[PDB]
């Protein structure tokens, strides 16, 4: 049972921010509930598996495609390209939203909202969930950033140690050789001297 609060702007209200909360179970295509609010009031409504299918049919558009568009419009899924438009009458409580492509506006779907009776309260619930959300993602960030640090220091550290070790190892054989030759040739100094004295014996 996912939900998704997304902040929008109404065409009616250029400067004033508004919040769209959708909510469902996990598809969008199975239907969804849909509160708007502005701080100060709160409107709701429900869409259904089949209303969606009909809407798509109206647009002569393949169903995955259409739901594609729905997620991007309703869930802040928008690409850089994508421009979406949101329209609401307080008065008629009608919600429609559209996409804007080659300077045409293409309606993407509509809603019947029903102004809500308990306003300051669903606002409460809403904005408790956001505190919980922001706190979770905060804490997960603190953790990921600390692992990132750990990891970056430890990778830098093996890289250097490792390469210093590959050099030393590559110079080792000859190095041993050289230590071995001085020792054996000192032995041979001693062989020569004893042998010569034995000659003179």
């Amino acid at each position: 049972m996912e939900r998704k609060i997304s902040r929008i702007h109404l065409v009616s209200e250029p400067s004033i921010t508004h919040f769209l909360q959708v909510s469902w179970e996990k598809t969008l295509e199975s239907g969804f509930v849909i509160t708007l609010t502005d701080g100060h009031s709160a409107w709701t409504g429900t869409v259904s598996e089949s209303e969606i299918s009909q809407e798509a049919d109206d647009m002569e558009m393949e169903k995955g495609k259409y739901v594609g568009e729905l997620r991007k419009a309703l869930l802040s899924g928008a690409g850089p390209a994508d421009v979406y438009t949101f329209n609401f009458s307080k008065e008629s409580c009608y919600f429609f939203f559209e996409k804007n492509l080659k300077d045409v506006s293409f309606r993407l779907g509509s809603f019947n909202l029903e102004k809500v009776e308990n306003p300051a309260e669903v606002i409460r619930e809403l904005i408790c969930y956001c505190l919980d959300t922001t706190a979770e993602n905060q804490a997960k960030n603190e953790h990921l950033q600390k692992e990132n640090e750990r990891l970056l220091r430890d990778w830098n550290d093996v890289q250097g140690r490792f390469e210093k070790c590959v050099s030393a190892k590559e110079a080792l054989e000859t190095d041993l050789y050289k230590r071995f030759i001085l020792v054996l040739n000192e032995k041979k100094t001693k062989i020569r001297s004893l042998h010569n004295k034995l000659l003179n014996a």
Binding site: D157, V158, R161, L172, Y177, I181, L184, N185, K188
Partner: protein, 256 residues
């Protein structure tokens, strides 16, 4: 045909088949005679591979058995290359004694200084043997560095240390190993610079190395009251600071 350095020289080729009849053929185009089994005038047998006639020819000691690479320098130099240990697979008594006057049984002169070249070549015929255990190699190595003052060499900086790294959530319990740890990398550094590293804390470890978790420190110091030989407990940064200045820092800085 192509030469006769070998003319009037009789050869047994037993191995082979670098191939037994190739060489007999080649011998034969250097003026030389082949003979199926050895005899009072055969000069030497040639010996590519271990074998029945061969293994046996050695067990008698009439003849003296030489590697194919000798003939191939003769063929390549067009000359009758004097025998050098590096050529001999086995020596007949008379020849053994002639070469035991100037040479080791591996081929090093008694009387003439070796070389990089010349010793590489000596080293180059031996494969060992196993006659040697890691613990064993360690001491031999260690005493030779001590003998020769090689014991401060970096790559040997830690031979004398026997170290337990705190890599197990339960001391000495191999199945509690914490893997992919800064401490896993310290075992590699210690081993690379000569350390003996041990997966078991027992009498004879001279050092134990902690990183950031001190959770087992007190178990260690508790273990060590029961030891005779009283290990040190050290910080990981001991090993790094020692390797970074290419010699032992030491320890009392890094205690505990």
């Amino acid at each position: 045909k192509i030469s006769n350095i070998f003319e009037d020289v009789e050869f047994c080729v037993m191995s082979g088949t670098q191939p037994k009849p190739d060489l007999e053929n080649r011998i034969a185009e250097f003026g030389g005679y082949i003979v199926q089994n050895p005899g009072p005038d055969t000069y030497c047998v040639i010996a590519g591979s271990e074998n029945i006639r061969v293994k046996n020819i050695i067990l008698s000691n009439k003849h003296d058995v030489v590697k194919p690479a000798w003939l191939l320098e003769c063929f390549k130099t067009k000359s009758f290359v004097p025998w050098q240990p590096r050529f001999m697979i086995h020596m007949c008594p008379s020849t053994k004694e002639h070469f035991a006057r100037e040479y080791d049984c591996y081929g090093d002169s008694y009387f003439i200084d070796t070389d990089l070249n010349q010793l590489k070549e000596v080293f180059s015929g031996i494969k060992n043997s196993n006659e040697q255990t890691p613990e064993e190699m360690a001491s031999l190595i260690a005493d030779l560095e001590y003998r020769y003052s090689w014991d401060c060499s970096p790559l040997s900086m830690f031979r004398r240390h026997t170290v337990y790294l705190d890599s197990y959530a339960v001391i000495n319990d191999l199945s509690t190993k914490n893997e992919g740890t800064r401490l896993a990398i310290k075992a590699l550094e210690l081993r690379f610079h000569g350390a003996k590293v041990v997966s078991c804390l027992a009498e004879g470890v001279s050092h134990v190395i902690i990183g950031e978790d001190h959770s087992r420190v007190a178990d260690f110091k508790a273990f060590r009251r029961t030891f005779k030989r009283k290990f040190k407990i050290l910080k990981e940064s001991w090993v790094t600071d020692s390797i970074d200045k290419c010699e032992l820092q030491e320890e009392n800085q890094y205690l505990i």
